[PDB]
Design an enzyme around this catalytic site. Structure first.
Site, PDB file in Angstrom:
ATOM      1  CG  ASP A 111      -2.263   0.649   0.958  1.00  0.00           C
ATOM      2  OD1 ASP A 111      -2.396   1.358  -0.061  1.00  0.00           O
ATOM      3  OD2 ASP A 111      -3.188   0.454   1.785  1.00  0.00           O
ATOM      4  CD  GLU A 148      -2.905  -0.970  -3.922  1.00  0.00           C
ATOM      5  OE1 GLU A 148      -3.854  -0.271  -4.347  1.00  0.00           O
ATOM      6  OE2 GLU A 148      -2.826  -2.208  -4.085  1.00  0.00           O
ATOM      7  CD1 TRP A 149       4.609   4.226  -7.869  1.00  0.00           C
ATOM      8  CD2 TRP A 149       5.679   2.375  -8.544  1.00  0.00           C
ATOM      9  NE1 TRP A 149       5.826   4.608  -8.379  1.00  0.00           N
ATOM     10  CE2 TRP A 149       6.505   3.491  -8.797  1.00  0.00           C
ATOM     11  CE3 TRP A 149       6.144   1.098  -8.881  1.00  0.00           C
ATOM     12  CZ2 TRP A 149       7.770   3.369  -9.370  1.00  0.00           C
ATOM     13  CZ3 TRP A 149       7.405   0.981  -9.451  1.00  0.00           C
ATOM     14  CH2 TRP A 149       8.201   2.112  -9.689  1.00  0.00           C
ATOM     15  CG  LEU A 195      -4.636   4.961  -6.116  1.00  0.00           C
ATOM     16  CD1 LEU A 195      -5.626   5.777  -6.929  1.00  0.00           C
ATOM     17  CD2 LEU A 195      -5.334   3.809  -5.406  1.00  0.00           C
ATOM     18  CG  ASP A 234      -9.658   1.823  -1.947  1.00  0.00           C
ATOM     19  OD1 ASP A 234      -8.653   1.653  -2.679  1.00  0.00           O
ATOM     20  OD2 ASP A 234      -9.585   1.996  -0.714  1.00  0.00           O
TER      21      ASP A 234
HETATM   22  C1  VNB Z   1      -5.232   1.606  -2.148  1.00  0.00           C
HETATM   23  N1  VNB Z   1      -6.374   2.296  -1.516  1.00  0.00           N
HETATM   24  C2  VNB Z   1      -6.360   3.711  -1.944  1.00  0.00           C
HETATM   25  C3  VNB Z   1      -6.342   2.255  -0.038  1.00  0.00           C
HETATM   26  C4  VNB Z   1      -6.074   0.850   0.523  1.00  0.00           C
HETATM   27  N2  VNB Z   1      -5.915   0.934   1.987  1.00  0.00           N
HETATM   28  C5  VNB Z   1      -6.785  -0.083   2.609  1.00  0.00           C
HETATM   29  C6  VNB Z   1      -6.034  -0.813   3.713  1.00  0.00           C
HETATM   30  O1  VNB Z   1      -5.879   0.091   4.825  1.00  0.00           O
HETATM   31  C7  VNB Z   1      -7.168  -1.034   1.510  1.00  0.00           C
HETATM   32  O2  VNB Z   1      -6.093  -1.945   1.284  1.00  0.00           O
HETATM   33  C8  VNB Z   1      -7.275  -0.077   0.330  1.00  0.00           C
HETATM   34  O3  VNB Z   1      -7.206  -0.757  -0.922  1.00  0.00           O
END
Ligand code: VNB
Ligand SMILES: *[C@@H]1O[C@H](CO)[C@@H](O[C@@H]2O[C@H](CO)[C@@H](O[C@@H]3O[C@H](CO)[C@@H](O)[C@H](O[C@H]4O[C@H](CO)[C@@H](O)[C@H](O)[C@@H]4O)[C@@H]3O)[C@H](O)[C@H]2NC(C)=O)[C@H](O)[C@H]1NC(C)=O
Ligand SMILES: *[C@@H]1O[C@H](CO)[C@@H](O[C@@H]2O[C@H](CO)[C@@H](O[C@@H]3O[C@H](CO)[C@@H](O)[C@H](O[C@H]4O[C@H](CO)[C@@H](O)[C@H](O)[C@@H]4O)[C@@H]3O)[C@H](O)[C@H]2NC(C)=O)[C@H](O)[C@H]1NC(C)=O
Ligand SMILES: *[C@@H]1O[C@H](CO)[C@@H](O[C@@H]2O[C@H](CO)[C@@H](O)[C@H](O)[C@H]2NC(C)=O)[C@H](O)[C@H]1NC(C)=O
Ligand SMILES: *[C@@H]1O[C@H](CO)[C@@H](O[C@@H]2O[C@H](CO)[C@@H](O)[C@H](O)[C@H]2NC(C)=O)[C@H](O)[C@H]1NC(C)=O
Ligand SMILES: *[C@@H]1O[C@H](CO)[C@@H](O[C@@H]2O[C@H](CO)[C@@H](O)[C@H](O)[C@H]2NC(C)=O)[C@H](O)[C@H]1NC(C)=O
Ligand code: NAG
Ligand code: VNB
Lengths: 392, 392
Positions: A139, A172-173, A175, A200
């Site tokens: 994340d 998640e890079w 994003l 999300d």
């Molecule tokens: C990647 N998004 C923007 C936020 C991420 N943080 C949450 C965990 O705390 C979930 O994994 C959710 O996908």
């Protein structure tokens, strides 16, 4: 990512959408993030056919960690909710024939505020490997610079490689690059097996439409970067929960197949309707998602509250999805020349067309000059498979 | 409106949401606006238990008219789609034990562009009465002034009364006044059996939420005026169509019961799931909607993405609805002191509580000191009936 993994989009289960960060095991024991939840979920993944359909990664999201690292600087599972530890959980998961995914964050904290991995990339990677982790969702919260973001993602990729254990690496890079700069997908793909591009998902048709519209709007930038070893991630499947009608569930399943998306369910396998189960376990649609050519599909046309998407498959076959975005009235007729589909190759000289969704039905042979006519439910999708053929 | 009708909210079926203005009987014979469509619906209203459940008014919306009036200045049904004419269709509907509703517009044209009734109020009312019409939905398009709007709605009310036939009078009056002037609901109620306040429903959870939010926002203005003979109309039930999940269907059914709403289904009675049918025919929930006291319910509280609504019933009973507006995660716990319910009388000294939706289950006796705890699905509603123990 050239680690030999994710040669087709990864399939599994991930707790986040349905269970989130519920830490109240006293008042909400059946929904709190605990080792018992994941053990029971593993049992059902085996017994209810999920593993057989292809769902093999049982994944923990945020809120599994103890509030602080141990004396030797290593992450630890929460002592009350995960008293037996991740290594024992992984042993149990492997004994069922499944693989275990875990969650960490590139910055100083996870998004829920638990220990981040900045400054601990190598030790955290080796810890996960020693525990038997098979997938890492990484994340992006609490990262103070684009340079730190990129360096952390690249470093964690390298550290996981240095462990010598095969671990799917989900990033998640892209994003988290959004508030500052456009992603370079050649680099991201070099370092990651999957990467999330958009916000999300939640348990709503609105979120499905948003993911689809963002994807189609940006498809010139992201579709061609996807392929074996590296996929665009449009986030979890939410079929089986509460906010989607049957036709909206069909739409998500069909379009996640069109998009060569990783298929990570986020639901409660202990409480899922037979209809949702049959859709999520649909062998033909999963086969489309898992097509070995691994070329992501795209939006071919849009207009009059209709969308046509298509995906090239192995062996001159194509999948075609038709979405009715008009949210009033009844099933709407849509006709298209089959020569317009699959770049004009699908039905040259003919194709055999099989409807897969909403119901499976052979439609027959269509010669290159013929027209295909369908009726699509409001917010639903008709998914078809076209097989090139010289017969009839 | 004191015409002896709609002493409880009117129940029936209306074609608009599901079938709209489909005039293409050549390409769509089974879904075009035609005499055959309404005959089929009438047959199924009898045979599939709808009439027994209370659904009695089979209603035509816009797009039934011929393009122009006849030589004598009267409205005519389309000669091709309604070849035997409205009077004959009404005779058939009456032979089934049902009542027939029809549509007209206060202005110069209907919203779909067919002949309006301005300048023809008396002749149109007498025509409808001669035809055997039992209900009129009177639309508000193509009206150039608020004065013409009010004058037309009142004039048509008086004309219907003067025919001497009992005709339910459904008005769109307040909705077309709102952007310009606040409605006087004492006056509207004097002239109308139902009145629409808010924009059209469609086949989406978003539309349901908007209707509920407008109702709760305006409840000080509209709740107390409703009662036997005159109801707030939050538009059609869309259960059984394509855009609502099961829990969203439950929410619509429960809250239309709380709101003492007219219950006009708009769906395809030829193609409706057993689940949707059992919900729409729910005897206990319909009994709440049809409670003879006819006091509209209201939103008691909102917060933490929860809503609590309640409705006083005959014989010291109360209905209570709890909505979960959080569209992520799982069933969420909500607790409330039963002394806070029913203005403090429902459970003083005790009450027996029965859950009706999403499933029926007796919860037991609750003392005045007790707290009620429920888990509510995302976008779903828990509906309860409370019976004071002094009436037991
Ligand atoms: C990647 N998004 C923007 C936020 C991420 N943080 C949450 C965990 O705390 C979930 O994994 C959710 O996908
Ligand atoms: C750490 O990173 C290194 C790379 O920096 C990575 O090594 C790479 O591993 C992959 C997968 O094992 C290798 O790809 C193979 O190359 C050999 C060369 O002959 C082929 O035999 C393989 O082909 C089979 O597998 C493919 C699937 O990847 C199929 O497409 C194919 O049809 C065959 O079935 C495959 O191409 C790659 O050569 C190395 N790269 C190097 C050594 O530079 C290593 O795996 C990473 N380690 C961990 C633990 O992640
Ligand atoms: C045209 O407008 C006039 C004026 O508004 C309207 O007359 C009204 O008709 C209704 C019903 O036809 C009358 O309501 C009745 O009121 C009397 C009291 O005087 C009651 O006894 C009646 O009781 C009914 O309800 C009982 C349960 O309480 C039932 O057992 C049974 O159904 C009884 O019939 C009933 O409530 C109202 O009094 C008149 N008002 C006037 C001023 O005359 C007329 O109906 C309209 N015509 C058309 C065609 O719309
Ligand atoms: C985690 O927090 C530390 C300390 O706040 C960050 O380290 C600082 O980084 C800034 C710029 O990156 C420097 O100006 C400071 O000198 C650093 N302080 C220390 C004590 O090292 C670190 O960058 C944070 N990590 C992430 C990923 O944001
Ligand atoms: C995006 O990043 C990629 C990955 O580094 C860059 O492409 C590589 O650049 C390196 C550095 O010169 C070369 O060694 C590789 O051969 C390149 N690979 C490929 C596949 O081209 C790319 O230049 C970057 N693009 C932008 C616009 O910054
Ligand atoms: C709202 O409309 C009602 C009905 O037209 C009005 O109530 C009447 O008011 C008159 C005074 O002009 C009284 O003589 C009547 O007794 C009332 N009732 C009826 C049945 O006529 C009311 O005044 C209007 N209010 C506003 C603010 O316009
Ligand atoms: C209908 O049209 C006529 C002629 O333009 C106009 O005078 C009249 O006010 C209109 N009626 C309404 C209700 O708009
Ligand atoms: C009252 N609303 C604003 C418009 C109405 N016109 C349509 C028929 O043309 C439907 O009756 C719909 O309810």
């Amino acid at each position: 990512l050239d680690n030999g993994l994710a040669r087709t989009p990864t399939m599994g289960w991930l707790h986040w959408e349905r269970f989130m960060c519920n830490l109240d095991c006293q008042e909400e024991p059946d929904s709190c993030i605990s080792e018992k939840l994941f053990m029971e979920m593993a049992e059902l993944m085996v017994s209810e056919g999920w593993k057989d359909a292809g769902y093999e990664y049982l994944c923990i999201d945020d809120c599994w960690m103890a509030p602080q690292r141990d004396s030797e600087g290593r992450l630890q599972a929460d002592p009350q909710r995960f008293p037996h530890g991740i290594r024992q959980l992984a042993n149990y998961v492997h004994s069922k024939g499944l693989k275990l995914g875990i969650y960490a964050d590139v910055g100083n904290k996870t998004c829920a505020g638990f220990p981040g991995s900045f400054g601990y990339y190598d030790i955290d990677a080796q810890t996960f490997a020693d525990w038997g982790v098979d997938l890492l969702k990484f994340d992006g919260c609490y990262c103070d610079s684009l340079e730190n973001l990129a360096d952390g993602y690249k470093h964690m990729s390298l550290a996981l490689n240095r462990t010598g254990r095969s671990i799917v690496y989900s990033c998640e890079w892209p994003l988290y690059m959004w508030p500052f700069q456009k992603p370079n997908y050649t680099e991201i793909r070099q370092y990651c097996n999957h990467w999330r591009n958009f916000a999300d998902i939640d348990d709503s048709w609105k979120s499905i439409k948003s993911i689809l519209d963002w994807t189609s709007f940006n498809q010139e930038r992201i579709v061609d970067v996807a392929g074996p070893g590296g996929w665009n991630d449009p986030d979890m499947l939410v079929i089986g929960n509460f906010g989607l009608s049957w036709n909206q569930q069909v739409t998500q399943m069909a379009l996640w197949a069109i998009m060569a998306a990783p298929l990570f369910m986020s639901n409660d396998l202990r409480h899922i309707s037979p209809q949702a189960k049959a859709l999520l376990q649909d062998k033909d649609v999963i086969a489309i998602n898992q097509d070995p050519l691994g070329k992501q599909g795209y939006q071919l046309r849009q207009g009059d509250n209709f969308e046509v998407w298509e995906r090239p498959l192995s062996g001159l076959a194509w999948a075609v999805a038709m979405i009715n975005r008009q949210e009033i009235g009844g099933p709407r007729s849509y006709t298209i020349a089959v020569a317009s589909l699959g770049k004009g190759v699908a039905c040259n000289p003919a194709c055999f067309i099989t409807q897969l969704l909403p119901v499976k039905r052979k439609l027959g042979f269509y010669e290159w000059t013929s027209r295909l006519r369908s009726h699509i439910n409001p917010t639903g999708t008709v998914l078809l498979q076209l097989e090139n053929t010289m017969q009839m």
